[PDB]
Design a protein around this nucleic acid. Structure first.
Lengths: 507, 96, 23, 102, 511, 7
DNA sequence: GACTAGATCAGAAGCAGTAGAGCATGCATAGTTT
DNA sequence: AAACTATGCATGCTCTACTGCTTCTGATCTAGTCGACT
């Protein structure tokens, strides 16, 4: 998967789309606008390098390269930004609907062939490589052309041509007074006709709920940190790739701006002599360190050369039982090692054999690891990792090796000596009861970083000039009320059984 | 050494660098003119090419009295060497 | 390929974080 | 503007002030009418010749100005029927104020 | 912490001659002293060293008297170690012809310790005797010597050219040394007599970088009514160099002649400078930059109550996997010092968690400015101490969803039976653990956790070489450093035939 | 129990 | 020949991630002076 | 016995540099059309 994903939001501008079934309900047009805005915000937060477009059909005015009738391309394929969101915001309400009607109009005819032609033309203009081509149809008219059959045939032919080109088509059908029926006309235009998507739907599509669900977490495409060589010995070498399945998420780096006109500035660092005033490059100056009441002077090149031990890669040392590995010896986040057949042919077979035998014998490969040049070596353990799938066969644990760093003698710290006091069985039983009362299931994606979420919310509020920032609920805060209700009296019994009458833990 | 005059071009080296250089020159005994004047005899540039230097010379002459001696174009190396030695240094072709 | 993220093709959709839910 | 308000280091002025400045081609002195927030220095300055509300005790007032002053004031319920009636009666008696028809 | 070491040395002619096939005792003692001095110099522990020698023609000590206390010189008094001491060891210390009795040298060392110890809080005192025991013994003052040693609380150690083919005089010397050790400490004293060969092996590596963790008090809270006072320390972390390189001027070799400063200027032909008071912060929101002043950022920043250790919940240990561990440290949580109720409560929690086979998902915040974290605390029980071990856990953002092909169901990379047998043979031959059947226990032939970091060893070696040789290229990596980073030769020997077989069976062509 | 010259 | 327009390769820019140094802030711990 | 100051540790933010992977852009090249000549 290489390139960018392009999406086009086709929104019908027919009269039937501007009628609300109930007074306290959202019109289909407003729902489509809200979905587009949500997708825009999600793309800005997650993938800012993607391309989006917004096109309307069935209007009175037109704006397109080919100069068709009743097709107004509101926004062409361009990276998302706050300006487009603000522009779309002027159609959200009823006054926005009036503004949209005045600007473009509604109630005119249209031909789906022209719409698809305009979409294809928009796709062709983009110069960047596009991994995905996608179009979404926000409409509530299952029979766009019932009076004319030639128009339907032309639309079918254009949809087929687009499908052959490699353009995905999706139908976000909206509520209809009568009921949407895909079988009428949209069975062929839509790229994939699901078996369940054949009955008459009396409610908006379920995909709108997914679209409205804002995702405020960055998405990174698969990439290899390094492509190194595993050396069983001097003459047996295979090629492996290293990946970081877990990586800390950081706020985007701040940028320095000028106060007067918000124009970015450039920061430069320089070093000058005090007694002469001249400028010194980072080669005239030396390095120093005061040991034993004396000064030791080393050049920069020598200082860098102090760290040269061995060439980059992994060197095999032996195999160790997994029992000897310790959980509390954590030093650094682990990495993932996978075969890489491009550099060396035959690496995959040996890697698979090693993984199978390591799983069978429950052993881990001890290795010496050197990520880059002029970096001191470390001792790592490659633990086999089998392929684990979930109920729906979606892979949850890939096959390969888990690279875990092992601490040196300097990475451990001595602990103060503390006398051991053992609790009586009754206290342990009461604590067991409390623990059982406070039991819950844990998942790796059950928590979110409050700082990053609040930062994203504040940034969006500032960019869109919203009245107040949206407040993010913190799921990491203990539920004091629920815990108190569940525990009941157990806390009092434990405190009576473990603490003297006058202890005052807080004090 | 009141005989010689030294001027530093502000718009190409920065305010902080110019201030530091003027302070060092003053502490070393050199007299540096804060503002451009006809009495200036040496002009020092910083990170500049020949074309920009000649254009600056033309601009300065455009608002200078006739029958005078325009300063000589010099590089920052000359000023740094003079400050290091503590006394004015002879001018060579490289500095010009 | 059920569960694929509509917003971001090629990435598996992630369920909303539920925090702690006692049994 | 909310962030600026929460930081007491600047003055916020409604656009109407600059429109009036353009209209008269002269620098019009500020006023709480053309303001949304005041820094401590401006609070001290306006606290001298301008009362805490949007009224002055150096320049007279008209119907529109008094309406503007009353707009800022919010309803409060520190009174009780009988005491409000008694205070109204005392006010009506004080300034020869018994001549109203209603 | 603070310590005083008085190295007593023998410089009589008895050590000037030995078997040509082995190093002379004098050279071995010099090497041991030099290694100790290097370790002390490169480990700033505020320890002081003095050097006394017996067996030289000179005589310089506080207590002269008559013929007694002669041929003993207090070469170096109590002071912090430095390179001049190493230079003095290299050249100034020379062999001597006269003989001396090491009892007088011990008396001189005791007098030096007594005189120079006053005025400073020296919590430890040591005297090391480097003697070959060739000279005759005058044991006319043993009782008073032992009494003084006991009263002053001074430790004693010996270093001899032979480990516990010698002359009868050496046997008598060893007997008297054993008697002295027994009197001083008893049976265990027999373990305080070392040999030069043994000491050289132990002192061939620079001391490890050591730092003291700061005790972190807090309260483990389960709800709003249960709280246990706890103290947390840092157990495992990536150690860094205590000191950093300092930039100096090449000519004058001074840090005062070099100034670093950062300036800001706009993207204009003039490159005009702007002060730091006219610089604002901003962020990237799509295709445009949104200003965000720092004061507004602090106003809108996520605020939390700092220094919190709360129990979000309890979950089975299976649900938490090691591959998801995050952060850069491991925390060890004990009960509050001088607190019995807290100890009982923590022990109850640890035992309950272990019995139920479950861990605690907790929220941890170092202080007000620190960002909140979600981590896992699991019990750690040992025969002598128990505690909790806390390790950070990942957020939803940190997780990455990457798809990899399956190797088990691949028709092109499927290993054959012979290949699997070869891999099995390789794994069996290259085992790094020995299974003792008598105790049914696994012994680690290559313990990684006991290997000092080669980075610091290399840095110290290069710094020492530069200090003692100002004009010389840096040396290569020491052989013992490579040896300690490689598996034992026995493991390598058994892996030859399996490796050749694996080469034969597995084709590998570089592309 | 390493102490003395070894500590 | 010449032009124009298609398709192929290699270097530079962007980006991600790591390491080193400095700063600021907060806090704790221990030595010195009165 | 109490207050001030030297020393150290833990953490967040920022400049600066360096290495590696991926994508975009400038540069190096064959087919179609018109025209020149003989």
């Amino acid at each position: 998967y290489s390139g960018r994903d392009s999406l086009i939001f086709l929104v019908d501008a027919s009269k039937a789309m501007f009628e609300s079934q109930s007074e306290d309900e959202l019109t289909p047009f407003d729902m489509s606008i809200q979905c587009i805005q949500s997708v825009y915000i999600s793309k800005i937060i997650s993938s800012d390098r993607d391309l989006l477009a917004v096109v309307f059909y069935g209007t009175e005015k037109d704006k397109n390269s080919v100069n068709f009738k009743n097709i107004y391309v509101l926004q062409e394929l361009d990276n998302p930004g706050a300006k487009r969101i603000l522009e779309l915001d002027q159609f959200k309400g009823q006054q926005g609907q009036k503004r949209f009607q005045d600007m473009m109009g509604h109630g005119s005819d249209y031909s789906l062939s022209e719409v698809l032609w305009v979409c294809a033309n928009l796709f062709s203009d983009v110069q960047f490589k596009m991994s995905h081509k996608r179009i979404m149809l926000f409409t509530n008219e299952d029979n766009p052309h019932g009076n004319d059959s030639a128009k339907a045939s032309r639309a079918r032919t254009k949809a087929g041509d687009l499908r052959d080109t490699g353009i995905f088509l999706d139908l976000m059908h909206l509520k209809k007074p009568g009921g949407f029926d895909i079988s009428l006309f949209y069975r062929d235009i839509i790229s994939i006709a699901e078996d369940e998507d054949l009955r008459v739907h009396f409610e908006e599509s379920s995909k709108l709920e997914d679209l409205l669900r804002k995702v405020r977490a960055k998405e990174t495409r698969k990439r290899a940190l390094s492509r190194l060589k595993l050396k069983l010995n001097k003459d047996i070498v295979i090629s492996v790739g290293i990946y970081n399945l877990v990586q800390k998420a950081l706020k985007p780096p701040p940028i320095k701006l000028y106060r007067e006109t918000n124009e970015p500035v450039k920061t430069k660092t320089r070093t000058f002599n005090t007694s002469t005033g001249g400028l010194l490059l980072p080669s005239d100056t030396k390095r120093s360190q005061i040991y034993g009441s004396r000064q030791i002077i080393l050049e920069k090149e020598e200082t860098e050369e102090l760290k040269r031990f061995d060439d980059p890669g992994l060197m095999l040392m032996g195999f160790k039982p997994l029992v000897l590995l310790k959980k509390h010896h954590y030093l650094r986040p682990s990495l993932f090692v996978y075969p890489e057949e491009s550099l060396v042919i035959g690496s995959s077979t040996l890697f698979s054999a090693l993984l199978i035998k390591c799983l069978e014998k429950e052993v881990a490969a001890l290795c010496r690891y050197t990520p880059r040049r002029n970096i001191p070596p470390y001792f790592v353990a490659l633990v086999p990792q089998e392929e684990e799938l979930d109920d729906q066969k979606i892979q949850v644990t890939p096959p390969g090796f888990q690279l875990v760093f092992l601490p040196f003698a300097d990475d451990k710290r001595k602990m103060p000596f503390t006398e051991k006091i053992m609790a009586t069985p009754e206290q342990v039983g009461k604590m067991k009861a409390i623990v059982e009362k406070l039991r819950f299931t844990y998942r790796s994606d059950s928590f979110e970083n409050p700082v990053l979420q609040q930062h994203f919310r504040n940034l969006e509020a500032l960019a869109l000039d919203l009245m107040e920032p949206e407040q993010a609920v913190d799921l990491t805060l203990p539920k004091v009320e629920a815990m108190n209700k569940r525990l009941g009296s157990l806390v009092d019994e434990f405190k009576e059984l473990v603490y003297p009458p006058d202890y005052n833990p807080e004090g | 050494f009141p005989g010689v005059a030294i001027y530093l071009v502000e718009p190409r080296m920065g305010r902080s660098r110019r201030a530091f250089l003027t302070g060092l020159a003053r502490s070393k005994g050199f007299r540096v003119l804060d503002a451009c004047s006809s009495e200036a005899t040496h002009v020092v540039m910083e990170e500049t090419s020949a074309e920009e230097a000649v254009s600056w010379q033309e601009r300065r002459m455009a608002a200078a009295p006739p029958g005078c001696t325009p300063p000589a174009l010099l590089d920052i190396s000359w000023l740094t060497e003079s400050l290091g030695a503590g006394q004015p240094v002879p001018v060579e072709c490289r500095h010009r | 390929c059920p569960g694929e993220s509509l917003i971001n093709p090629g990435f598996k959709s992630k369920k909303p974080a539920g925090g702690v839910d006692f049994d | 503007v909310k962030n600026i308000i929460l930081s007491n280091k600047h003055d916020v002025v409604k656009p109407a002030w600059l429109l009036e400045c353009f209209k008269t081609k002269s620098f019009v002195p500020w006023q709480p009418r053309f303001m949304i927030h005041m820094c401590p220095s401006t609070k001290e300055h306006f606290a001298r010749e301008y009362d805490c509300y949007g009224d002055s005790y150096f320049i007279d007032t008209d119907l529109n100005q008094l309406k503007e002053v009353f707009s800022g004031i919010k309803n409060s319920n520190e009174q009780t029927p009988e005491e409000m009636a008694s205070l109204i009666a005392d006010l009506e008696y004080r300034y020869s104020w018994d001549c109203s028809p209603l | 912490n603070k310590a005083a070491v008085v190295l007593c040395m023998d410089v009589g002619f008895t050590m000037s001659n030995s078997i040509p096939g082995i190093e002379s005792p004098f050279e071995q003692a010099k090497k041991v002293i030099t290694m100790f001095v290097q370790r002390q110099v490169f480990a700033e522990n505020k320890d002081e060293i003095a050097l006394v020698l017996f067996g030289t023609d000179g005589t310089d000590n506080p207590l002269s008297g008559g013929d007694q206390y002669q041929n003993i010189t207090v070469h170096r008094h109590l002071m912090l170690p430095d390179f001049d001491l190493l230079e003095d060891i290299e050249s100034k210390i020379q062999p001597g012809s006269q003989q001396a009795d090491f009892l007088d040298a011990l008396i001189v060392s005791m007098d030096v310790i007594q005189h120079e110890t006053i005025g400073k809080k020296f919590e430890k005192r040591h005297i090391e005797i480097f003697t070959d025991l060739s000279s005759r013994f005058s044991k006319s003052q043993l009782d008073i010597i032992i009494h003084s040693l006991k009263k002053c609380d001074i430790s004693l150690q010996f270093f001899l050219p032979f480990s516990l083919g010698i002359t009868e005089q050496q046997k008598e010397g060893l007997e008297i040394v054993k008697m002295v050790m027994i009197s001083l400490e008893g049976e265990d004293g027999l373990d305080e007599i070392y040999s030069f060969s043994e000491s050289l092996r132990k002192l061939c590596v620079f001391k490890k970088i050591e730092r003291h963790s700061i005790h972190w008090p807090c309260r483990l809270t389960i709800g709003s009514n249960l709280s246990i006072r706890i103290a947390a320390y840092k157990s495992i972390l990536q150690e860094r160099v205590k000191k950093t390189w300092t930039v100096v001027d090449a000519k004058t070799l001074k840090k005062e002649d070099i100034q670093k400063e950062t300036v800001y200027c706009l993207n204009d032909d003039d490159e005009t400078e702007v002060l730091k008071e006219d610089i604002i912060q901003g962020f990237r929101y799509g295709s445009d930059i949104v200003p965000f002043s720092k004061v507004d950022e602090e106003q809108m920043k996520y605020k939390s109550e700092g220094k919190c250790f709360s129990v979000l919940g309890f979950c089975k240990s299976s649900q938490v996997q090691r591959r998801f561990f995050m952060g850069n440290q491991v925390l060890k949580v004990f009960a509050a010092r001088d607190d019995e109720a807290a100890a009982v409560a923590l022990s109850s929690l640890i035992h309950a968690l272990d019995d139920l086979d479950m861990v605690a998902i907790v929220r941890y915040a170092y202080d007000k400015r620190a960002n909140p974290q979600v981590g896992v605390a699991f019990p750690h029980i040992k025969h002598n101490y128990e505690c909790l071990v806390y390790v950070q856990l990942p957020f939803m953002e940190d997780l990455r969803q990457y798809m990899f092909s399956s190797l088990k169901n691949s028709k092109k990379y499927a290993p054959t039976e012979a290949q699997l047998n070869a891999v099995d043979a390789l794994i069996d031959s290259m085992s790094l653990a020995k299974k003792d059947e008598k105790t049914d226990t696994l012994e680690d032939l290559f313990p990684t956790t006991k290997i000092p970091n080669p980075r610091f060893q290399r840095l110290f070696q290069c710094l020492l070489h530069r200090a003692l040789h100002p004009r010389e290229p840096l040396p290569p990596i020491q052989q013992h450093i490579w040896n300690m980073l490689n598996p034992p030769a026995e493991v390598t020997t058994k892996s030859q035939i399996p490796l050749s077989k694996i080469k034969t069976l597995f084709p590998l062509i570089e592309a | 129990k390493p102490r003395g010259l070894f500590s």
